[PDB]
Amino acid sequence: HMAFIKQAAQLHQQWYLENRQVVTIASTHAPEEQQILEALAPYLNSDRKLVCIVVPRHPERFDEVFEICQNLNLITHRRSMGQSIHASTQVYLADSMGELWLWYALSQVCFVGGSLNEPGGGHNILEPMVLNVPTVVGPRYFNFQTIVDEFIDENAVLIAQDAQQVVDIWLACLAEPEATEQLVAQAHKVLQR
Amino acid sequence: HMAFIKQAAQLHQQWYLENRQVVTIASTHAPEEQQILEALAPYLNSDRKLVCIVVPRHPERFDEVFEICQNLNLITHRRSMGQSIHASTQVYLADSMGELWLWYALSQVCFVGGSLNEPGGGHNILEPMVLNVPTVVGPRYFNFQTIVDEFIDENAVLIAQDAQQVVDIWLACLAEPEATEQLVAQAHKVLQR
Amino acid sequence: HMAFIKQAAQLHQQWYLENRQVVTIASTHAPEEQQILEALAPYLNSDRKLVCIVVPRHPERFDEVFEICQNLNLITHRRSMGQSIHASTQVYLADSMGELWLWYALSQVCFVGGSLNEPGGGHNILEPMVLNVPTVVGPRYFNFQTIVDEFIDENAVLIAQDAQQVVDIWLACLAEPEATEQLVAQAHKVLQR
DSSP: OHHHHHHHHHHHHHTTGGGSEEEEEEEEOTTHHHHHHHHHHHHHHHOTTEEEEEEESOGGGHHHHHHHHHHTTOOEEEGGGTOOOOTTOSEEEOOSSSOHHHHHHHOSEEEEOSSSSSSOOOOOTHHHHHTTOOEEEOSOOGGGHHHHHHHHHTTOSEEOSSHHHHHHHHHHHHHOHHHHHHHHHHHHHHHHO | OHHHHHHHHHHHHHTTGGGSEEEEEEEEOTTHHHHHHHHHHHHHHHOTTEEEEEEESOGGGHHHHHHHHHHTTOOEEEGGGTOOOOTTOSEEEOOSSSOHHHHHHHOSEEEEOSSSSSSOOOOOTHHHHHTTOOEEEOSOOGGGHHHHHHHHHTTOSEEOSSHHHHHHHHHHHHHOHHHHHHHHHHHHHHHHO | OHHHHHHHHHHHHHTTGGGSEEEEEEEEOTTHHHHHHHHHHHHHHHOTTEEEEEEESOGGGHHHHHHHHHHTTOOEEEGGGTOOOOTTOSEEEOOSSSOHHHHHHHOSEEEEOSSSSSSOOOOOTHHHHHTTOOEEEOSOOGGGHHHHHHHHHTTOSEEOSSHHHHHHHHHHHHHOHHHHHHHHHHHHHHHHO
């Protein structure tokens, strides 16, 4: 776990991420990659600073998600091919096993998937919370209902109704260092008790 | 497998389970832990002999289920923290990987989950059957439709319609050594042929 | 991966598969095994050359699927028991982990499951495509929507509406060396670009 934190520091340096804004969609299911990348693509085209890391939940779907990215005409590099995030990279497909912590440790904001699909149900938001990443989930989070509600009650997690709202919320967070600082603070409160 | 049987004998002794009634909810999904623990909590509060082992199907949900237990105000100890079943323990969260056989080998009765949720579908009831544990499933068992029907046809498995009925059935089994002996007998018939 | 290809050559020889027609249902979910085996059983009874390999997606379901086969009165041998395909074998239950490539490498035609059930969603068709196996999927393939559509657009994958249609399509492929040769050709086109 902590090994991932220091590998993230090595990669932050080698990939020159200091002047990139890294947004991550984590543990995604269909049609979440299509919907969020479609909503985000105008910004990835207009603002080369942004880059989206995509971590699909199911490995059998990695090539499927590469095709989604390709069809959206987004420049996409792949962890499975030992690629890195280039200045040119718009989407980094993190198509490997066991490295979710590394990607969260590199992220400015994230979205935890399994939560915009139907029927959905959600995935564990504690991992990005612990790494101080502002976190968005969709409305279908019932497999983690207790924990997500503990965080909604303390204004510690952001709930999106659709893929457009995930992108709104992300762009707002990236523009609002004070709001994101307060969100990470409230998360740390819930996490401690 | 057989290693789990003898470890169960060691733990039965060290945890003084001879005067506890161990009920297990195994391979559970949301909202099965909430629903069954809610139905059972009055009995766990009134009768300190009872203790419920909870084995959620998905490891990413272990901390979620701990929160469910905590909110129900039930005294809960965790395998992941190297805890044991205390006299005070009301719920033992078996939040570890690969040890389902151990928990069934410690159980007086069980419920096999994935079967009260929607759409459900069920999990493998053969494991508790082979270990001579009286077994309850919910009505949504269609992923194991053939095998569960073979056992319903020989009165060898108990079907619950809801979480209240799982608890009724369990309390009845625990009060009825002759009925539970006959159930385990009928299960062994199906298992042999 | 390539190790599986040469093991397939060893088994093709030892099991005398040269005069069998091997049809495979791969990564199946309930009720796909029941539905397809029911549709196929008249042919497996009338034409001893045919044999169906069954590879259920979830290992916990292997004994369940054995029971499905047994109830259909089909002669069934099991990889887990170190069995082989006999002249007498009608269904080979490939109840082992990690060997899907071997079975596709032995197949004349296949069906990729998770795609006739509800709500379905499908599994990765690239694996049989790469091994030159004519491939059928059901209509519920939305987890692989992009890739399956790339193959439908080039007439490179067969879509079945129900279990009867999977069996129609298979029997037609086996009777049509020219059509199956053209299908494998179109698949290889999509795969190259």
